[PDB]
Amino acid sequence: KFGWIKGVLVRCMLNIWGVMLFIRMTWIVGQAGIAYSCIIVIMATVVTTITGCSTSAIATNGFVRGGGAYYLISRSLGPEFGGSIGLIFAFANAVAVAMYVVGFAETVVELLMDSGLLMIDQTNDIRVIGTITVILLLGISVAGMEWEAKAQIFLLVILITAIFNYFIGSFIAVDSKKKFGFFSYDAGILAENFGPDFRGQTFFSVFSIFFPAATGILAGANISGDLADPQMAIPKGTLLAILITGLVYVGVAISAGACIVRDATGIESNFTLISNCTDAACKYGYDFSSCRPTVEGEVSSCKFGLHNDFQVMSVVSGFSPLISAGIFSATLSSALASLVSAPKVFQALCKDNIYPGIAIFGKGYGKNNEPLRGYFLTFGIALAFILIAELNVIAPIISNFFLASYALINFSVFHASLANSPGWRPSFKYYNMWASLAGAILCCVVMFIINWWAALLTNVIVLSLYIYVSYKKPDVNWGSSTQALTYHQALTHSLQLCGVADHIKTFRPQCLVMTGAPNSRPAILHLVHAFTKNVGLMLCGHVRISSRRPNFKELNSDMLRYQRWLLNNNSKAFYTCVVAEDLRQGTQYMLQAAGLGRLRPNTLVIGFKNDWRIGDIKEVETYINLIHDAFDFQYGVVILRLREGLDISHLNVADQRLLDSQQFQQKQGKGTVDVWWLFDDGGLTLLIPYLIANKKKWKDCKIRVFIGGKINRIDHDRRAMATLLSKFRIDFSDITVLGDINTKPKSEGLTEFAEMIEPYKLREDDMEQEAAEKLKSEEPWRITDNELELYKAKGNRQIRLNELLKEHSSTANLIVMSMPLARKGAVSSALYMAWLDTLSKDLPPILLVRGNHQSVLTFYS
Amino acid sequence: KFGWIKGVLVRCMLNIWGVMLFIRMTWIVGQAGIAYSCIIVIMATVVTTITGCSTSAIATNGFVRGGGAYYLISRSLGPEFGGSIGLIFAFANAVAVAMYVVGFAETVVELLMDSGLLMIDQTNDIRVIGTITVILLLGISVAGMEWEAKAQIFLLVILITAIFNYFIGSFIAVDSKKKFGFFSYDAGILAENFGPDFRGQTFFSVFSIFFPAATGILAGANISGDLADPQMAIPKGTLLAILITGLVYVGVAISAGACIVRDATGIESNFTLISNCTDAACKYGYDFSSCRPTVEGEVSSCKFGLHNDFQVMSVVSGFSPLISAGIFSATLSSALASLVSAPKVFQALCKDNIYPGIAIFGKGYGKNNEPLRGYFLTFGIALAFILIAELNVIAPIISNFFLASYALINFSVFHASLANSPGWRPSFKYYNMWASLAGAILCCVVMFIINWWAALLTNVIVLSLYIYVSYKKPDVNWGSSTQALTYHQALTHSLQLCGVADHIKTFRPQCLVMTGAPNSRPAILHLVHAFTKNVGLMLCGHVRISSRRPNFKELNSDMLRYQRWLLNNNSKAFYTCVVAEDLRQGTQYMLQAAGLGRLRPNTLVIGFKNDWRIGDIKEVETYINLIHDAFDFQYGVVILRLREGLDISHLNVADQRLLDSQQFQQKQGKGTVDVWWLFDDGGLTLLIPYLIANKKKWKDCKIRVFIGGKINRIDHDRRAMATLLSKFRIDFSDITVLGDINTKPKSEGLTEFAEMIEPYKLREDDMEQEAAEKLKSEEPWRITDNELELYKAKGNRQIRLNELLKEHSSTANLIVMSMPLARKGAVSSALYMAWLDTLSKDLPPILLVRGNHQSVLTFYS
Numbered sequence A, B: 001k002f003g004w005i006k007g008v009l010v011r012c013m014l015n016i017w018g019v020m021l022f023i024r025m026t027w028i029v030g031q032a033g034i035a036y037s038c039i040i041v042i043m044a045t046v047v048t049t050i051t052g053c054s055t056s057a058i059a060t061n062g063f064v065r066g067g068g069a070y071y072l073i074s075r076s077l078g079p080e081f082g083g084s085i086g087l088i089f090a091f092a093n094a095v096a097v098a099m100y101v102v103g104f105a106e107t108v109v110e111l112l113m114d115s116g117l118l119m120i121d122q123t124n125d126i127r128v129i130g131t132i133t134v135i136l137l138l139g140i141s142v143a144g145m146e147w148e149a150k151a152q153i154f155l156l157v158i159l160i161t162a163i164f165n166y167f168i169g170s171f172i173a174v175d176s177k178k179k180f181g182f183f184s185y186d187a188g189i190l191a192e193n194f195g196p197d198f199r200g201q202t203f204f205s206v207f208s209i210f211f212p213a214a215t216g217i218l219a220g221a222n223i224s225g226d227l228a229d230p231q232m233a234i235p236k237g238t239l240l241a242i243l244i245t246g247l248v249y250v251g252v253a254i255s256a257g258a259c260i261v262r263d264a265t266g267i268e269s270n271f272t273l274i275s276n277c278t279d280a281a282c283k284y285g286y287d288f289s290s291c292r293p294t295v296e297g298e299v300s301s302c303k304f305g306l307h308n309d310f311q312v313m314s315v316v317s318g319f320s321p322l323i324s325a326g327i328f329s330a331t332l333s334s335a336l337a338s339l340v341s342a343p344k345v346f347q348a349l350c351k352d353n354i355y356p357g358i359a360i361f362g363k364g365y366g367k368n369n370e371p372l373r374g375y376f377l378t379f380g381i382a383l384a385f386i387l388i389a390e391l392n393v394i395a396p397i398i399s400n401f402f403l404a405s406y407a408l409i410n411f412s413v414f415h416a417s418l419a420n421s422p423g424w425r426p427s428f429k430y431y432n433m434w435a436s437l438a439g440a441i442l443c444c445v446v447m448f449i450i451n452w453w454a455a456l457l458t459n460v461i462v463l464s465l466y467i468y469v470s471y472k473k474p475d476v477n478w479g480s481s482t483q484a485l486t487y488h489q490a491l492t493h494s495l496q497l498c499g500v501a502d503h504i505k506t507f508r509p510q511c512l513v514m515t516g517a518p519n520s521r522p523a524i525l526h527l528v529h530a531f532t533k534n535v536g537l538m539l540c541g542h543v544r545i546s547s548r549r550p551n552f553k554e555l556n557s558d559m560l561r562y563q564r565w566l567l568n569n570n571s572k573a574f575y576t577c578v579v580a581e582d583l584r585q586g587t588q589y590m591l592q593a594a595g596l597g598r599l600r601p602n603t604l605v606i607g608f609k610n611d612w613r614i615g616d617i618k619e620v621e622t623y624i625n626l627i628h629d630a631f632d633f634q635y636g637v638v639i640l641r642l643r644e645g646l647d648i649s650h651l652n653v654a655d656q657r658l659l660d661s662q663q664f665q666q667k668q669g670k671g672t673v674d675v676w677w678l679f680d681d682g683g684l685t686l687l688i689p690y691l692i693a694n695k696k697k698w699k700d701c702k703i704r705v706f707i708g709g710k711i712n713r714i715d716h717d718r719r720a721m722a723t724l725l726s727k728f729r730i731d732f733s734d735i736t737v738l739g740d741i742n743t744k745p746k747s748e749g750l751t752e753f754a755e756m757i758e759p760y761k762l763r764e765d766d767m768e769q770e771a772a773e774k775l776k777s778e779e780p781w782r783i784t785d786n787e788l789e790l791y792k793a794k795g796n797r798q799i800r801l802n803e804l805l806k807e808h809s810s811t812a813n814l815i816v817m818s819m820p821l822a823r824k825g826a827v828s829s830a831l832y833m834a835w836l837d838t839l840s841k842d843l844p845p846i847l848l849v850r851g852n853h854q855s856v857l858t859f860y861s
């Protein structure tokens, strides 16, 4: 658990200081000037400072523990950005391994050719030595990670003594080091090297070789689970290492340009002052002409100086072979820090199953779950690029991919500050979103100036990887590590949904379904899944009827189990379990306390209870008063009834019930639905069949809108209903008007209905009313104003509508029927249940429905 | 209301056939070969066929009436794509006007220099004549648009007779048309021109000049409000005009390549067979050497042939000066068709206030609301480009902008097919989304090959115009981005949150705050808004205690009032109003029914009942049994108490009530917040002060921990406290272990605690208890096992903890103390209140808190 120095600053300084510090800093002052190379260093420092502020803005957005480089970006921002940043950054480190070990092998090859050892040609010995040192770094990565955390301060004190040896060796004018270039600090060599030469390169061709010397700044953010306090450790160490390394780069460029000439023959001259005919700032007796190129379209056939030999810092240095062999400390550290950092990002990326096929590079073998397949993939990508045994073609690829990664980071923090992402509050003092936009545009434009077709390929790939993660299914076991953003999104969307204008008032029918346990009664789940499918809100209520000692402990586990079952099938429904001693006071909990904000259930849809006369006659009072508790909260009451019941508890008629309970989700809609618009203030009675008719399962549904009308004028009433049907855009005009209602209600069925309520001539479980009978009357069966004195017409109309249902709606899928409402108290519950059961005697799957008559058709605008 | 021919096909063939048909088709066979130019025409036909299928997918998305070109795109797709397509297409037609009139002016200048009329140099006469003909087309556009609808069939029959004149003039071998090239159809000239020459150009530099001759296909879709049946007229006419014009281009290229030589001196030769030393296919006695260029880096110094003269189709034609000078019919139509079409799209774009400043270019003067400021802007953008009086530099700009517009159309229909947009069902037979994606990628890649920095500028501008309209104040032509998209996103994110893995299980505390009316008790709003902000979920509850006949009618008005009252302040809380007979059952309504899915309240926070000794002891049973009902559902319980009141019933004592009822939103913190960790399995007791301490108000507040224990090891248990505090992310060393609990409970304070319960000494506000003790024994004060026998040490512990709180916590902002829990049934409710009120007598704003010991510290991972 390191501090900020040993955990961030030392790692970032060892990662930044790499190949170009000793190998290629003098060549950059050779090609460009001192002024242009300083402009190059300031440009790279601006890019990496803006990216350091964006990384510090990410690192201070909470989310400390269980960190890394992929983790912070993927948790603060979305998966769509973080997956592409992880892939591009992993590939950038994988290709950078090759660059660092190619620089190491080139240094070893030139030190070998300074002796007599030479096996094959020069460009093949780099492949041999680079292959040998990449199979040796992989073994250190997969077998020796323990000593590496102690070795890094030793590598840093080798490297800083190398830098100090070069810087104090420049001040010592040696006459033996003349003819290799390197006179003392002179004004003539300062003025001569002020201004570009560009002997085969250009600006933005020299810059693309420098820019790998500025990368490696995310080596402090690559350990957030090994830091003490990351929100203080990362912005100090990263933004201080950038300053220190950039200042050392500026000092090396200015010091190399002011003491070494651009070309030099390695032959000493006896003169101390040359003959006065050259004036090329070499007044120490060296004539360095006939070493510059003749034409302006070729490289020089010289061998020393700033342009030619690539190793002049070992000449300038006070002690060459051992202190300025900190190149072996600079390259081999950085390559190693890029060999352990690409499979880390790629294994954290393959544990969230964002991209489909790459998920086999996450199985970490061993005790630490080190990704060995990721190490072998990184070894393959590095060894493919090693065989291009030339630094000046590998380095622009590294610059392209790291510039793409840094532009993605800056654009992602800009876009998250712009969009007001819900979990995005970057408490960092020097973060600005417009600076991040400027840095992203700068990296993208420079990436196109360096090479336009490589940049176009990279941007097309990143755009494809963004659009793929945007439009892909949000189901479970897909990227489930990123979960804390979904909570804040679901909270802020509901917080915006609760606040709208007070004069819009869209209807959007919500519904709670008294279904019991959701694995039981599946037909009502499929039928209230038919309508309110990405249209409204569905809700499954379940009242547990345990009276004494309710098992409050196992309610949460059973709720989570039932919700996981309901999510494992196709359903857009939530689940609410309450616990009471009966059904009515149990559903009183969910009538007036369900939902949050505007996601409250509007209508109540229940099933019909067929077993009301078979046994337990008490609970009928719990069932009708429920409806009388549903009509008082201005809800909508929907009753569903099949030919047989829905309560499934598991042979011939049992299989008939089990097959009728799943008659919707698997079958089709061959056969017409038909509504019966009888009440004018129904409302929802027409919204329901239009919603259930526009579905995949329902195509062959001719909505036969029936309406009881005036008997005198049967001509224009159907036109006045047809314009309302055109207003509701249900798009059918098969309207049939009836006039034979309440005429002669089939007295042989009147004798069936009168013998139905014959044991209930005194009302059901009304012990107060029954004991209040005896204080006025002795014969009990004389109160009939409640029962049949004032409501002959209601019962006659109910049985007449039953006969019309049997006649006109013989073959049908559903029947949307307006539900008869009677005022409570004056009408008993048993009489009302008798009317509802005689209205829907042995029909097809009818649907009694009565709305709140507040306002409809505000839906669909 | 035209048919498909006269309204789509004639318009598209007049817009497509333009400059390059007669001026620059033969030069394209001059630079490239016949094979490469045929490849060029087939590639342009592929791009325009894919874009025509995308336009026909857009045009068949319903939406017949109220047409246009911006309207169809902006209404089928979104405004973000439609605004950028409208802007880029308007700019492309505005710059295309200049290309067509520059071709016209160049033709008139060459016809003038064939005579003796020559005012200034050649490149200035084009500027003069082009300026004169653009100030004349503008007057026709703003004053003579009626005759143009009749003139177009006359223009087309001029143009087709020009094409037929050229094609029948090729078959007539004239010996006078020799020496300007043009032998008959020969096999030697066909074999000589099969293969590129590229005398100063490249492939994709010749394609970029051809591709403006394939554009113009959106001239049929640009009039959809003047069309009879657009879903038949637009694909038929567009996809037939593309085939006709491409076949004519292929025919012109093949015919011109096989009868004219590339270079020719305009001098006749007396010979009929050349001397047998050349063999360069001119065996008709013409030595056409000494016009081929010497080096491979210059143009030929010749004057005729395919490479040089640009007007060789007037030489091949049978009647030159009148029929094949139907270039005046080809250019001046197309320019006019691009002068009436850029202000049209730019005025339809500026009537939707999408982009801010451009809204003044929409005020249409006159009767038809013709956009005159748009006409003047198009005139200015054209006239700035006519001053570059060269066709071969104007034409790649037109190619880049039209390729950008076609790529935007193709990508937009692919993105609308991919995302399943709500109103996107393109009933067209030959639409495929992957063909559109291929066309978009092809147009983008070709746009980058032609000129990479112009393409990069165009893509940056189009991306900026997309991201601007994506994130804006919503002012769309409809309100589907206000109520529909918000509901869909909120419901699908609630369903996404409710379905996750069962083993993640973060805590993320949600709170049921009992405030009553939210304009009352604002201190509890500010306190449980301090924590559970940007972390959890706040759910303010209000019970209505209306017993007799509760109102349910206008309670929706009260809920919509108080929700807007919450949202007008900076609060993120939801509101739930229930109605019961007392507060306990009303809170029990919200304990098991509030929230949906995973957004249910886990904790319950109430305010302490200050006036419980004054009157109405019968409701204290409703307060304590609420707490015992809160602990039954495994809820955490937080109780807030102030020394003064909490609610606001609206002189100077009321002032100190009101000024301390709002003591959190306008004050700050400079000092300490102290906790009293006294229970092992609390967990939330430390989670709450860490959450309230990380706030902008509570920045200067140090957390001080108090803890009981033993006396032998007081430096040992604070280490065990410090490691779990480091596990709880506070890490404060102000943990002072005390050893004064249940030791010596300060006998002078026992008198007030004894006299407080003195009217309750065996009167615990229960009728059943008094009824049991009136017949069990004869004295009242009998069952005192709960009163003093079994719970003496508990009451002495509370009465000692109060004095410890007064000693060590006299001046503090917040006091977070653990709450004593007793077992119900045995311990009286009045005894429970006697324990709770003694703990918080004259204290700062204390906070009693007891967790549910389920799982904490899974928060922050």
Ligand SMILES: CCCCCCCC/C=C/CCCCCCCC(=O)O[C@@H](COC(=O)CCCCCCCCCCCCCCC)COP(=O)([O-])OCC[N+](C)(C)C
Residues within 6 Å of the ligand: A417, A433, A434, A435, A437, A438, A441, A442, A445, B460, B461, B464
């Ligand atoms: C090659 C090298 C490239 C380098 C330069 C690259 C150019 C890019 C340079 C961009 C820097 C310039 C923009 C800064 C100005 C902001 C003004 C301001 O301060 O007010 C406010 C903004 O409100 C505004 O007024 C925004 C005005 C800027 C819109 C211009 C976007 C540029 C699109 C570029 C299109 C491509 C450009 C090219 C197209 C041809 C401040 O912001 P805020 O709303 O208060 O939010 C802060 C919230 N903080 C509180 C989160 C916590």
Ligand SMILES: CCCCCCCC/C=C/CCCCCCCC(=O)O[C@@H](COC(=O)CCCCCCCCCCCCCCC)COP(=O)([O-])OCC[N+](C)(C)C
Residues within 6 Å of the ligand: A356, A460, A461, A463, A464, A465, A467, A468, A471, A472, A473, B404, B405, B407, B408, B411, B418, B419, B420, B437, B440, B441, B444, B458, B459, B462
């Ligand atoms: C001036 C303006 C000019 C503008 C010009 C613009 C032109 C610029 C051009 C930009 C091109 C960008 C478009 C490509 C995006 C395609 C996405 C896609 O098709 O995926 C889909 C299927 O496809 C698959 O299943 C493929 C498997 C995954 C591959 C990811 C896509 C290819 C990435 C290659 C990277 C190589 C990686 C190499 C390194 C590893 C997603 O499948 P789904 O889940 O079923 O989605 C259904 C959505 N629904 C549920 C809502 C119905």
Ligand SMILES: CCCCCCCC/C=C/CCCCCCCC(=O)O[C@@H](COC(=O)CCCCCCCCCCCCCCC)COP(=O)([O-])OCC[N+](C)(C)C
Residues within 6 Å of the ligand: A404, A405, A407, A408, A411, A418, A419, A420, A440, A441, A444, A458, A459, A462, B087, B091, B460, B461, B463, B464, B465, B467, B468, B471, B472, B473
């Ligand atoms: C590897 C991959 C590398 C990736 C590298 C990335 C590639 C680089 C991509 C870079 C794309 C850059 C996108 C910048 C977005 C613009 C800023 C914006 O959104 O509006 C801002 C200001 O807006 C204004 O006030 C001015 C309105 C126009 C500005 C945009 C058009 C400029 C370009 C057209 C020029 C003329 C063209 C016409 C002539 C043809 C919004 O301001 P706000 O105060 O914040 O509003 C708050 C409301 N909100 C919170 C809801 C938001």
Ligand SMILES: CCCCCCCC/C=C\CCCCCCCC(=O)O[C@@H](COC(=O)CCCCCCCCCCCCCCC)COP(=O)([O-])OCC[N+](C)(C)C
Residues within 6 Å of the ligand: A460, A464, B417, B431, B432, B433, B434, B437, B438, B441, B442, B445
């Ligand atoms: C350079 C210039 C030249 C460029 C030219 C070459 C460029 C290459 C461009 C495009 C290449 C063409 C892609 C062909 C894919 C067809 C397979 C298929 O039919 O899937 C289908 C079958 O659904 C399935 O059964 C699953 C099959 C996997 C989906 C394949 C997606 C490939 C993503 C490739 C990502 C490429 C990213 C490119 C990044 C560079 C799924 O979709 P659908 O059912 O058909 O939906 C129809 C809906 N509709 C009826 C409304 C329309």
Ligand SMILES: CCCCCCCC/C=C\CCCCCCCC(=O)O[C@@H](COC(=O)CCCCCCCCCCCCCCC)COP(=O)([O-])OCC[N+](C)(C)C
Residues within 6 Å of the ligand: A453, A456, A457, A460, B202, B203, B204, B205, B396, B441, B445, B448, B449, B450, B451, B452, B453
């Ligand atoms: C590698 C993948 C193959 C893809 C095949 C695709 C089919 C390609 C078909 C054919 C391939 C192209 C053949 C001709 C090459 C263009 C020659 C040319 O005109 O010079 C060009 C550059 O000069 C170069 O450097 C060209 C080097 C090759 C780049 C083109 C391949 C990239 C294809 C896309 C890679 C991304 C793939 C995206 C995802 C699919 C132009 O130079 P300029 O300075 O810009 O012009 C100045 C204009 N001015 C004079 C008016 C100022």
Ligand SMILES: CCCCCCCC/C=C\CCCCCCCC(=O)O[C@@H](COC(=O)CCCCCCCCCCCCCCC)COP(=O)([O-])OCC[N+](C)(C)C
Residues within 6 Å of the ligand: A444, A456, A459, A460, A462, A463, A466, A467, A470, B411, B415, B444, B459, B460, B462, B463, B466, B467, B470, B471
């Ligand atoms: C040279 C490269 C060739 C291609 C160039 C590309 C041409 C560009 C032209 C047209 C293409 C348009 C680009 C985005 C495509 C839309 C699809 C999408 O992302 O859906 C997402 C939308 O996304 C957004 O809302 C913001 C856009 C973010 C884009 C960031 C890309 C970063 C890659 C940088 C690399 C590119 C660098 C370009 C060069 C500088 C999600 O869909 P949604 O849920 O419906 O969102 C609704 C949000 N709302 C409710 C607030 C409205």
Ligand SMILES: [Cl-]
Residues within 6 Å of the ligand: A016, A017, A018, A019, A020, A021, A212, A213, A214
């Ligand atoms: Cl380096």
Ligand SMILES: [Cl-]
Residues within 6 Å of the ligand: A215, A216, A217, A218, A219
């Ligand atoms: Cl990096």
Ligand SMILES: [Cl-]
Residues within 6 Å of the ligand: B016, B017, B018, B019, B020, B021, B212, B213, B214
């Ligand atoms: Cl043209």
Ligand SMILES: [Cl-]
Residues within 6 Å of the ligand: B215, B216, B217, B218, B219
């Ligand atoms: Cl067009």
Ligand SMILES: [K+]
Residues within 6 Å of the ligand: A015, A016, A017, A018, A212, A213, A214, A215, A216, A334
């Ligand atoms: K580096």
Ligand SMILES: [K+]
Residues within 6 Å of the ligand: B015, B016, B017, B018, B212, B213, B214, B215, B216, B334
């Ligand atoms: K054209």
